[PDB]
Amino acid sequence: SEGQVHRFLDQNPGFADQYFGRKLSPEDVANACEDGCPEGCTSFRELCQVEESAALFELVQDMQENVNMERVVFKILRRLCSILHADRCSLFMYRQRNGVAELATRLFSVQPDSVLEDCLVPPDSEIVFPLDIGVVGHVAQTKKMVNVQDVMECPHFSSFADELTDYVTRNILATPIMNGKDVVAVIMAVNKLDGPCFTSEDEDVFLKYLNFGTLNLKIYHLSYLHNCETRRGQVLLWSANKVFEELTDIERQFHKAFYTVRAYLNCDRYSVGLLDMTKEKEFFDVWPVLMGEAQAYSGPRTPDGREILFYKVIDYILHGKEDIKVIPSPPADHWALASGLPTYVAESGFICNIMNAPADEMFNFQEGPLDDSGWIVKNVLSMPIVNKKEEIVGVATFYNRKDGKPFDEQDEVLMESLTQFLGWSVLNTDTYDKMNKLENRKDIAQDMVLYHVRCDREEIQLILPTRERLGKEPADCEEDELGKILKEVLPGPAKFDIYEFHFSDLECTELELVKCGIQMYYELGVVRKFQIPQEVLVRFLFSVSKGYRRITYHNWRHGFNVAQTMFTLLMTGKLKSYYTDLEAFAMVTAGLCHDIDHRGTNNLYQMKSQNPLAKLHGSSILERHHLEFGKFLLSEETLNIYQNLNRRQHEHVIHLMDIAIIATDLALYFKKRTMFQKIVDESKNYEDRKSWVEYLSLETTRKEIVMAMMMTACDLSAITKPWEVQSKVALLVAAEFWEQGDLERTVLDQQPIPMMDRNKAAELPKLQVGFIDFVCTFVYKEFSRFHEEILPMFDRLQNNRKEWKALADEYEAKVKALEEDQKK
Amino acid sequence: IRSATRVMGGPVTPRKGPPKFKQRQTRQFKGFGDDIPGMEGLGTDITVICPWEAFNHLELHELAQYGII
Amino acid sequence: RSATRVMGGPVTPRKGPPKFKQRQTRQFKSGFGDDIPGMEGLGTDITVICPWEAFNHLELHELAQYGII
Amino acid sequence: TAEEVEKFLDSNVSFAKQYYNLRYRAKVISDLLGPREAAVDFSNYHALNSVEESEIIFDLLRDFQDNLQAEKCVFNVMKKLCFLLQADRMSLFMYRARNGIAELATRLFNVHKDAVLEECLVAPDSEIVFPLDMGVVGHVALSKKIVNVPNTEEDEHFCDFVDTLTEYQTKNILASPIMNGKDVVAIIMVVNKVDGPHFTENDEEILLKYLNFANLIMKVFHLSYLHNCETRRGQILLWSGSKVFEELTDIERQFHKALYTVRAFLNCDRYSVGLLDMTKQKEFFDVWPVLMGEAPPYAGPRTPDGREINFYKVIDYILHGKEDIKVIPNPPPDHWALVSGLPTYVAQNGLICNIMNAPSEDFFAFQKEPLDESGWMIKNVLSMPIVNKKEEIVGVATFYNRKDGKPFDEMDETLMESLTQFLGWSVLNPDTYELMNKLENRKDIFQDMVKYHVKCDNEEIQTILKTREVYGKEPWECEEEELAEILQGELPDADKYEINKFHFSDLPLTELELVKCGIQMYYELKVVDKFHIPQEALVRFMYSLSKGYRRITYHNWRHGFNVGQTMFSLLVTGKLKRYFTDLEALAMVTAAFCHDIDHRGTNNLYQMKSQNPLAKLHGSSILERHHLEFGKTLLRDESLNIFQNLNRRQHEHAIHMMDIAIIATDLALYFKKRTMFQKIVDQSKTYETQQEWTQYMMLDQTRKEIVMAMMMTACDLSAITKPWEVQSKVALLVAAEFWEQGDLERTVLQQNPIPMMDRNKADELPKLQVGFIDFVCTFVYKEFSRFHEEITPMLDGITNNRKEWKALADEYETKMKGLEEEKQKQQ
Numbered sequence A: 001s002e003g004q005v006h007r008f009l010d011q012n013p014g015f016a017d018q019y020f021g022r023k024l025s026p027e028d029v030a031n032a033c034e035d036g037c038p039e040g041c042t043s044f045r046e047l048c049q050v051e052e053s054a055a056l057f058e059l060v061q062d063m064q065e066n067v068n069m070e071r072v073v074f075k076i077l078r079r080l081c082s083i084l085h086a087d088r089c090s091l092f093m094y095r096q097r098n099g100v101a102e103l104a105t106r107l108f109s110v111q112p113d114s115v116l117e118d119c120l121v122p123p124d125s126e127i128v129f130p131l132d133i134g135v136v137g138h139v140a141q142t143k144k145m146v147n148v149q150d151v152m153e154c155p156h157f158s159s160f161a162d163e164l165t166d167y168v169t170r171n172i173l174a175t176p177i178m179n180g181k182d183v184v185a186v187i188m189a190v191n192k193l194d195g196p197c198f199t200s201e202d203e204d205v206f207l208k209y210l211n212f213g214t215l216n217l218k219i220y221h222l223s224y225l226h227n228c229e230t231r232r233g234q235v236l237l238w239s240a241n242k243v244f245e246e247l248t249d250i251e252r253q254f255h256k257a258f259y260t261v262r263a264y265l266n267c268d269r270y271s272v273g274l275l276d277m278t279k280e281k282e283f284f285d286v287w288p289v290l291m292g293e294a295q296a297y298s299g300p301r302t303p304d305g306r307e308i309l310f311y312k313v314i315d316y317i318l319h320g321k322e323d324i325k326v327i328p329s330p331p332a333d334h335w336a337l338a339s340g341l342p343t344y345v346a347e348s349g350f351i352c353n354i355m356n357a358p359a360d361e362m363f364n365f366q367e368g369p370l371d372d373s374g375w376i377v378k379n380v381l382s383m384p385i386v387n388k389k390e391e392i393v394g395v396a397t398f399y400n401r402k403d404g405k406p407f408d409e410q411d412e413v414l415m416e417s418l419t420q421f422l423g424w425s426v427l428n429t430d431t432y433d434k435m436n437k438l439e440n441r442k443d444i445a446q447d448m449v450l451y452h453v454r455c456d457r458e459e460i461q462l463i464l465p466t467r468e469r470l471g472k473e474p475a476d477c478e479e480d481e482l483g484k485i486l487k488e489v490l491p492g493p494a495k496f497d498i499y500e501f502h503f504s505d506l507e508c509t510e511l512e513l514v515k516c517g518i519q520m521y522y523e524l525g526v527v528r529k530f531q532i533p534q535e536v537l538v539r540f541l542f543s544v545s546k547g548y549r550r551i552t553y554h555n556w557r558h559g560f561n562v563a564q565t566m567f568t569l570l571m572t573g574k575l576k577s578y579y580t581d582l583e584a585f586a587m588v589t590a591g592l593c594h595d596i597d598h599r600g601t602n603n604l605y606q607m608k609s610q611n612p613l614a615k616l617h618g619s620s621i622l623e624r625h626h627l628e629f630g631k632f633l634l635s636e637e638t639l640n641i642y643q644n645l646n647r648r649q650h651e652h653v654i655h656l657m658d659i660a661i662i663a664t665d666l667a668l669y670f671k672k673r674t675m676f677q678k679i680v681d682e683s684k685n686y687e688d689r690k691s692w693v694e695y696l697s698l699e700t701t702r703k704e705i706v707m708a709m710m711m712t713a714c715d716l717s718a719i720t721k722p723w724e725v726q727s728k729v730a731l732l733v734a735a736e737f738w739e740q741g742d743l744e745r746t747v748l749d750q751q752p753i754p755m756m757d758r759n760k761a762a763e764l765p766k767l768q769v770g771f772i773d774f775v776c777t778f779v780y781k782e783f784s785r786f787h788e789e790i791l792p793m794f795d796r797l798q799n800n801r802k803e804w805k806a807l808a809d810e811y812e813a814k815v816k817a818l819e820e821d822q823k824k
Numbered sequence B: 001i002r003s004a005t006r007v008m009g010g011p012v013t014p015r016k017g018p019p020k021f022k023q024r025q026t027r028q029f030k031g032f033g034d035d036i037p038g039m040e041g042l043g044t045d046i047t048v049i050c051p052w053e054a055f056n057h058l059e060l061h062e063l064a065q066y067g068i069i
Numbered sequence C: 001r002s003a004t005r006v007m008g009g010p011v012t013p014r015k016g017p018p019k020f021k022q023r024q025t026r027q028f029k030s031g032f033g034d035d036i037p038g039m040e041g042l043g044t045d046i047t048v049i050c051p052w053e054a055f056n057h058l059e060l061h062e063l064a065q066y067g068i069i
Numbered sequence D: 001t002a003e004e005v006e007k008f009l010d011s012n013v014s015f016a017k018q019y020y021n022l023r024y025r026a027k028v029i030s031d032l033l034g035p036r037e038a039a040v041d042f043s044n045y046h047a048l049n050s051v052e053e054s055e056i057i058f059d060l061l062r063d064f065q066d067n068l069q070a071e072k073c074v075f076n077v078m079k080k081l082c083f084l085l086q087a088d089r090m091s092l093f094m095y096r097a098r099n100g101i102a103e104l105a106t107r108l109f110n111v112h113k114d115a116v117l118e119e120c121l122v123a124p125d126s127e128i129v130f131p132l133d134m135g136v137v138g139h140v141a142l143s144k145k146i147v148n149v150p151n152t153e154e155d156e157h158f159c160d161f162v163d164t165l166t167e168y169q170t171k172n173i174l175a176s177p178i179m180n181g182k183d184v185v186a187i188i189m190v191v192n193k194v195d196g197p198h199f200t201e202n203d204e205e206i207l208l209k210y211l212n213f214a215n216l217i218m219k220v221f222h223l224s225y226l227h228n229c230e231t232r233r234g235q236i237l238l239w240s241g242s243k244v245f246e247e248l249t250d251i252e253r254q255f256h257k258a259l260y261t262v263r264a265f266l267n268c269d270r271y272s273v274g275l276l277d278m279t280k281q282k283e284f285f286d287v288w289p290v291l292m293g294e295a296p297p298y299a300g301p302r303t304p305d306g307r308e309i310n311f312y313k314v315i316d317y318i319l320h321g322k323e324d325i326k327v328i329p330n331p332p333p334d335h336w337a338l339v340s341g342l343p344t345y346v347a348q349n350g351l352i353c354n355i356m357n358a359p360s361e362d363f364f365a366f367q368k369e370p371l372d373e374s375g376w377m378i379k380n381v382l383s384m385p386i387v388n389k390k391e392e393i394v395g396v397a398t399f400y401n402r403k404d405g406k407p408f409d410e411m412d413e414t415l416m417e418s419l420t421q422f423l424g425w426s427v428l429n430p431d432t433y434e435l436m437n438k439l440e441n442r443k444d445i446f447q448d449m450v451k452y453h454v455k456c457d458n459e460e461i462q463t464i465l466k467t468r469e470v471y472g473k474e475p476w477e478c479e480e481e482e483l484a485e486i487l488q489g490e491l492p493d494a495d496k497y498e499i500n501k502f503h504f505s506d507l508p509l510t511e512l513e514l515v516k517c518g519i520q521m522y523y524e525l526k527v528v529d530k531f532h533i534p535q536e537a538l539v540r541f542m543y544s545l546s547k548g549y550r551r552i553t554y555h556n557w558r559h560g561f562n563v564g565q566t567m568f569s570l571l572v573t574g575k576l577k578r579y580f581t582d583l584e585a586l587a588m589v590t591a592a593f594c595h596d597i598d599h600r601g602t603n604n605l606y607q608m609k610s611q612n613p614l615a616k617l618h619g620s621s622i623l624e625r626h627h628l629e630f631g632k633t634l635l636r637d638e639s640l641n642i643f644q645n646l647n648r649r650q651h652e653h654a655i656h657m658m659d660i661a662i663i664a665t666d667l668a669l670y671f672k673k674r675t676m677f678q679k680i681v682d683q684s685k686t687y688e689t690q691q692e693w694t695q696y697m698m699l700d701q702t703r704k705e706i707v708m709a710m711m712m713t714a715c716d717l718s719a720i721t722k723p724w725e726v727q728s729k730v731a732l733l734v735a736a737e738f739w740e741q742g743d744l745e746r747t748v749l750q751q752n753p754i755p756m757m758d759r760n761k762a763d764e765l766p767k768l769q770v771g772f773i774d775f776v777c778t779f780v781y782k783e784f785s786r787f788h789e790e791i792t793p794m795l796d797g798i799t800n801n802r803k804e805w806k807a808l809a810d811e812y813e814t815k816m817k818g819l820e821e822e823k824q825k826q827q
């Protein structure tokens, strides 16, 4: 009997090793095997070896083509089931969510004869298993192979699959597939038909035979991780590119960043909601609640203490046709807000992962078709968006991964990185708002400054009495009428002798100086050539006069004196030969506004006191401020005397003004001083004056150097005045210096220099003599040598030096005869 | 067909209770920037302007007396 | 000694006209962005108006007449 | 015995095989898959039968362990293929790409039938680098196919450089590429078939069949390398993003912070960063000497942007030994990183440079000696530029001596390119930092000029505080007593001018007299002595308030003084002070005096419609918040601070009261909170005596604030309760201002003004005035009359004014009616 043969074989180990360990004839092994084995095989061992080697080679060839994973592991599971004489095997795939581990199913009830259709499980049929329930959880958590002799005696065993699948288990054997120190999957064999329990040989075969499925799963896991990391890197790079494009508000930045990376997320829909950031309410909004007219707020509150209020929601529909929608005021029944998950996320600040949203109890869902397209929510993942101050500014929620699988650890890491990067970028929005507010404040301050400096309607009537003579406002007057009015009021060319080197303003009022300033412009002839409006000219002169502060020395009188000295240098000194009319226009205009807003202190005091002037401007603190203020006044339409000028002429005038105003700095004059000497020396040998005038009229750089030198000479012109005018101005500068020294002593608590203290007020003649010897003499001697018409300046300078020296010797004799004679 | 696991509709699990959620990632990536060595030299200065060019020491002293320095 | 019989350094049967790669400026590079859908109604758009919601259109029109609104 | 059993087994050999594979297959599978040193006769060359084929197949399968050392496994496969293919030597040429030009270096060389790993492994310094278009190796790289060369002489693309170098002769070649699916990963080769003319087709079949095992090993190696590189790139980018957004800082500190943290993810011994100077154009005094001929023009390298190449700061990161970080301002040309000349070349061209075997390079000048005592010597470098959003090079970053002793490859280039791309984008933050600093400084400068133009100087203060005449000292030297005597001498009498009455008129008085009356008002509240207010500061503050008001048709200093006088009269004559304290009353008056300090003559609607900067800044209540801000600015000045002798709590309470008062002047806000004041007034009538009501109100802050707002609103509109003579002129002033704003609206903008503003309808003023009286003022005045009996004069005055305005409007309407029927309709 066949059963008799089988039993006699199995209960007789002595004979079994003998007959099967026999040299079998080649034709016998040829007939025994199906089809025909090659000549190599001669025994059962060789036949089994050849067959198994061929099967393993075919399996390797299958893995070679691409990443199949499922098919290869199914075939090796069938082979292992045949080898082990079991009847069931399964594949449980490791997955991590919310920081906890799970063991889903990927292959179930694989039998020695089966097809991939009846063992593969769709994502909607997996039996998830926590890391505590069941033997599989123990295997996953202990990272060790587990053999169970009897299931009924196993403490950590779960029967959950038995009722569902209607099966009874009597033996279990499992092992974790590892990719280093992380579990990838577990493979389990159930209900050993071979015998009562798993023998040691079956354990050894199970351990050895699985070194190939481990390789396949390792390849699959490595490919998945590489793809995920590449996608995360691309997302971060694109977000960084979009964030740094410009400075905008939070909403624009968030929308750009979220829209640009819509292809790297692989999601059906995702919505972004923005939370209000109002910390406190105003008095007129808290009054009704405190008076019992309205009920106090009672609802969810963020951990910062604010009120959850989504004031804007942006939707991204991607499954069908792209439809980006922005909701101004999100209704309470919005398809995203109605779940209640974003509100809970805002209250807590937790990353929430949902596997089966319809079968949920904490948050309610629609549990049906959201839209006519029949898109049903199946997987949700929500994260907060916090800045560097740990304040939630929004909530991002993602739905329905495209591939049809629940959100795993990699997706959580990717989207958390995206939201983390977007949270830090809020610092750009704060800087944007702060910049806008600063700009608005500066513009307001500039307007308030402009109102006070400008000349109003009533003030202009002191110079343009059109309200009575014409009975009309100056704006509506005609050019001819304005000129006729101006002719009478304006002083005559020789009334105030504005052409001389000895002009004194001590006998004229401020209005007289303004009228003389207008008369200089009329004398230069630029009024009729450039079509300068006369009302604009008068208003500009009055505004410039008002711009100067009411300080001791650097008041409007100093500016007018410098302008008049430049005018007489151009006209009386015959330095106009080298310059055109536009250059003279710009020169006079720059001379008027060279000390427009002097505060009464020099540059060094600005540097030492950390004034904002010393911070905004680095090299020439005050001299750059005056130019900026003067150009600010000229930018106004009503005060722009450059209204009718070509673009090239305007740029030329602006460049000349920039050169002239900054040139008044004494340090720059000291540095670039020998170039003027070289130019003078070149002039002295060229030829008669006509050829030199012809040549120098074309050299731009030499003309600019002479321009700067004339600026410097005009700035210090107060010394080349007659001794009556001198010795009176010299007291004003001393008073200003003494005031600055007092400010230095009280505020900065530093001892002033011997020039800048009231105690050494008897050494003024010596200091004046030293200043004359050091600074003025070089420039005035060089200008006298250049043009012989400027000799009176040098003569008066030498006379003033003689007078100051005589005073110094008198003081020295007095102090000598006191100290070294009276005491001794 | 009845499927391998005999389960339809959605994933089943033998775990009941309130779900747990991850806290955040707010420690691994978190005076500003002062512990970095070599940090002292870096920083914009307010003395990047040349005081004066090649001048005699007596003239340099004289410039200070007149506040032009 | 060595299987490749060279110890000083790598050897190549070529010459020395060094060639270097150009920077990529096509993928990422080439207000700023307005073609994005939904960008029009997403700015600051400061138009905060008090709803009033307590004045009928008679008194509302009267209030608007005097310019207080 | 089982003789019948063995006969039965012979009868059905299938059953015997079944029994054997049930009870014995597991043992043979366990033994074969375990260490068994497969026995194949390798002594001679012979054909392989099924048993030996199975043995060699189970080998190369025993090696599929967890460690999976690629080199050892591929070496074993090659050693077996040597016997299988009947070849003499084999080698492995790895595939790498540098500078966009792919190379083919060697890793395994000269493996024969009986060889060992140490004698066939190739160190990184012994590689034979081959271009991709020189030999048959390059041909198989390009064609991506197996190539068989029966004779080397007939081959056109065969190179004998290795043959001469390795004193070897090759007559046969057969190679095949190992691919990851679309990109080659390595090339295997055979040479000099033993005991044969050339490699046959069977050798090709054997090589193709046994190449399967090496493909998986190459795949796992490549996948692991790529995954590691991508993870490193992601970490680098995220760390850099974290460190950039910490705060706003200049480029140097930001770059140092970004580059210090990612030092671990960059597998380099050294790397340094140099910073270029971005100055584009000099100034006139710097171009004068060059043009005049005092200094030779600059001659040297220039960036493609058109600037001089100057490195003003270089940061060195040394990591091979002890971690040192140094910064060298104005580095000399002798610097170790700059002496090579590669940074200057990169700055000139803006190209990514990858250099292998740097010492043996002729284009540049690299040091060929140990740079330090440890013997660290430059072998491989990589330098790339940093480019901002305007295609301007900002700096150059260089990297040296990869840690694993291998030349830089494509992945390193991509990683560092992503890092430098991120760094170049982040330059926006330092630019915004500098712009912010400049804007803040510019704002601070302009605000001082307003302070000077509004503050009362020492010359104007002598018009009231005549200290320079009664004494010889300036007000600073004088003590408080002398100032008090001078003030009491100068200040006008209170009852003579009727400063606490509801009919006070400012028409005869002058503005200086109004300032003196304001000082007298402050004195009359007994506030100066209580809080130790400096009298000089009080006078200067009042004069500054007088000067700060614009010379507008209506909103002059006179209007502010009228509002302040009305508030004082309400506090004193109206007996509304019983609730508030002295400090609250002081805040009342001070906020009343500065409610429209800087009015421009236009309402909030014009500010909103014309997009004024005030509308952009404040938004909700433009002019009221502007006035509050400007008024608080003046009080913050030391010379104009009357709150200086106040503790923190008192000062905070005063400031809060001021903000409550000033904003409350808004008409919409008053319109939205009338019913609450009505409810307070109604509640006031449920108490028996006034004393109880005063006691209750003194402890209710919100109702006091509501009364604050209502009294401010009543004082703002107080000009409509004056006798007929004053109203007849104030109405015309207000109408003129409104007409001016309307004609401004018609010109600058393009909307017709409302009938309340257009100049043509100048004869409908009585109708608008009576409508305004009926709409706004009557409610507040009637409520205040109900609240306190002493406010009735205001009610009777306003009702008389309404009667007169109604009479005028009726006369005008009758005139218009008559002029339109007898003259226009019926004729």
Ligand SMILES: Nc1nc2c(ncn2[C@@H]2O[C@@H]3COP(=O)(O)O[C@H]3[C@H]2O)c(=O)[nH]1
Residues within 6 Å of the ligand: A088, A089, A090, A108, A109, A110, A133, A134, A135, A136, A137, A156, A157, A158, A159, A160, A161, A162, A165, A166, A167, A169, A172, A188, A190
């Ligand atoms: N019907 C069926 N159940 C299985 C199979 N494999 C494992 N199980 C069962 O799934 C269960 C999961 O928890 P356990 O590991 O404790 O015990 C296991 C087994 O009882 C299989 O192949 N078919």
Ligand SMILES: Nc1nc2c(ncn2[C@@H]2O[C@@H]3COP(=O)(O)O[C@H]3[C@H]2O)c(=O)[nH]1
Residues within 6 Å of the ligand: D089, D090, D091, D109, D110, D111, D130, D135, D136, D137, D157, D158, D159, D160, D161, D162, D163, D166, D168, D170, D173, D189, D190, D191
């Ligand atoms: N000595 C030796 N030379 C080889 C080996 N493999 C390839 N080569 C030689 O190196 C060369 C690489 O490109 P070739 O086309 O010149 O052909 C090859 C052969 O000439 C090897 O294993 N040993």
Ligand SMILES: CC(C)Cn1c(=O)n(C)c(=O)c2nc[nH]c21
Residues within 6 Å of the ligand: A715, A716, A717, A718, A719, A729, A730, A733, A768, A771
């Ligand atoms: C005050 C300073 C600009 C230089 N400066 C000057 O210009 N004048 C006219 C002086 O008399 C004078 N005395 C000292 N410094 C002087």
Ligand SMILES: CC(C)Cn1c(=O)n(C)c(=O)c2nc[nH]c21
Residues within 6 Å of the ligand: D716, D717, D719, D720, D730, D731, D734, D769, D772
């Ligand atoms: C708008 C504001 C001037 C309020 N206001 C006012 O105070 N007075 C006195 C008026 O006559 C008037 N007429 C309109 N609005 C007016």
Ligand SMILES: [Mg+2]
Residues within 6 Å of the ligand: A594, A595, A622, A623, A664
């Ligand atoms: Mg000056």
Ligand SMILES: [Mg+2]
Residues within 6 Å of the ligand: D595, D596, D623, D624, D665
């Ligand atoms: Mg107002």
Ligand SMILES: [Zn+2]
Residues within 6 Å of the ligand: A558, A562, A594, A595, A664, A715
């Ligand atoms: Zn000057």
Ligand SMILES: [Zn+2]
Residues within 6 Å of the ligand: D559, D563, D595, D596, D716
């Ligand atoms: Zn007002």
